[PDB]
């Protein structure tokens, strides 16, 4: 059945993602509390997601494709009242914002933009930055932080 | 890192269970894989009638593994003359990062799981979608699905090429149901759907009046 069954009929597969790093992470490096505390935003880190095993002619399509057979969407703990701010661990007071095709990514499940596919390749290009959380009394404190976002692909 | 083997799953009701192959495409680190079922409204279902086992498992680098899909006795309550809709979920849990200030991405794959009762068991390359009917309506078409299965329509156009590459909002018709779509009048309609294998065939219609059916 499907993968244990064998014959001429090709069965297309869902995508498998991977990044430059083995743990599927992006390192922001040490950040200045003072800078963040003053409204500063870290230098944008590239968040590239490689799509393998699947026909990319569905993510903004490869060489075209206007239809949408796969829905893309990010999910993660948000900042109270700000669905576009991925909350963080460690209590540092920081938050994370990811930008797609010029527009911010929302982490409440709403359909994302399956239009970030780098024309010509099989990579979704996003950018991420760290900033003082936009929550009342945030206060950027020092220390290490981390966050996990769910990249959801739903197939029709 | 974790991935599934198909974009949709058909559960043959004449059987008590089936397996889905999963894989850790990462060659450096282990990843956890969670699997679970959702009902037709995408609500998590824990006690049946369809169960995914194991709910969570560890996959060493490059490891291949499987998730079993099985049913409880109550699966018999579902209608036996039409498909029922479920969703299969596969979410990975990446290992904790070695680095300090970091953001990790975790993939989650969600596909359709069709419960196909024994009474409507299908042949290896049987085609029922050619049973679809098109009804001209003001501003478009009413797509009729008189079959006992779920049909996913991904294209409607005046030519085979347009059905395949033309802008179209994918719509899935439940068994014995219909849906209206905005569209231009085509004297020769072509429709494209997704079959059990993830293939995307194209049907050619011949209209007579405001009714259109696939040509023999």
From TrEMBL, chain B:
The keyword Chaperone applies. InterPro entries: Ig-like_fold, PapD-like_sf, Periplasmic_pilus_chap, Pili_assmbl_chap_C_dom_sf, Pili_assmbl_chaperone_bac, Pili_assmbl_chaperone_C, Pili_assmbl_chaperone_CS, Pili_assmbl_chaperone_N. Keywords: Chaperone, Fimbrium biogenesis, Immunoglobulin domain, Periplasm, Signal. The keyword Magnesium does not apply. GO terms for biological process: cell wall organization. Residues 2-120 form the Pili assembly chaperone N-terminal domain. SUPFAM superfamilies: PapD-like, Periplasmic chaperone C-domain. Residues 143-200 form the Pili assembly chaperone C-terminal domain. One of its GO terms (cellular component) is outer membrane-bounded periplasmic space. It is found in: Periplasm. Belongs to the periplasmic pilus chaperone family. This is Periplasmid chaperone PapD protein. It comes from Escherichia coli (strain UTI89 / UPEC). The lineage of its organism: Bacteria, Pseudomonadati, Pseudomonadota, Gammaproteobacteria, Enterobacterales.
């Amino acid at each position: 059945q499907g993968k244990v069954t064998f014959n001429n009929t090709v069965v297309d597969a869902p995508c498998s993602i991977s990044q430059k790093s083995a743990d599927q992470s992006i390192d922001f490096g040490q950040l200045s509390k003072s800078f963040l505390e003053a409204g500063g935003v870290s230098k944008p880190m590239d968040l590239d997601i490689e799509l393998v095993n699947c026909d990319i002619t569905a993510f903004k399509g490869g060489n075209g494709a206007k239809k949408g057979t796969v829905k893309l969407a990010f999910t993660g703990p948000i900042v109270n009242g700000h669905s576009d701010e991925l909350d963080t661990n460690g209590g540092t007071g920081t938050a994370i914002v990811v930008q797609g095709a010029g527009k911010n990514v929302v982490f409440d499940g709403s359909e994302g933009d399956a239009n970030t596919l780098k024309d010509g390749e099989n990579v979704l290009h996003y950018t991420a930055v760290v900033k003082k959380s936009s929550a009342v009394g945030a206060a950027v404190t020092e220390g290490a932080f981390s966050a996990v976002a769910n990249f959801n692909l739903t197939y029709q | 890192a974790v991935s599934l083997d198909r974009t949709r799953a058909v559960f043959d009701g004449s059987e008590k269970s089936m397996t889905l192959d999963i894989s850790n495409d990462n060659k450096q680190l282990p990843y956890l894989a969670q699997a679970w079922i959702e009902n037709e409204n995408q609500e998590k279902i824990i006690t049946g009638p369809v169960i995914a086992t194991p709910p969570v498992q560890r996959l060493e680098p490059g490891a291949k593994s499987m998730v079993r899909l099985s049913t409880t006795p109550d699966i018999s309550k579902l209608p036996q003359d039409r498909e029922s809709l479920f969703y299969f979920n596969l979410r990975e849990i990446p290992p904790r990062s070695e680095k300090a200030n970091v953001l990790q991405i975790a993939l989650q794959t969600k596909i359709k799981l069709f419960y196909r009762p024994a009474a409507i068991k299908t042949r290896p390359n049987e085609v029922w979608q050619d049973q679809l009917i098109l009804n001209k309506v003001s501003g478009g078409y009413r797509i009729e699905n008189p079959t006992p299965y779920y049909v996913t329509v991904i294209g409607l156009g005046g030519s085979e090429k347009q059905a395949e590459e033309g802008e179209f909002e994918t719509v899935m018709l439940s068994p014995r149901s219909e849906q209206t779509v905005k569209s231009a009048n085509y004297n020769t309609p072509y429709l494209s759907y997704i079959n059990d294998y993830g293939g995307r065939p194209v049907l050619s219609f011949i209209c007579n009046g405001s009714r259109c059916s696939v040509k023999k």
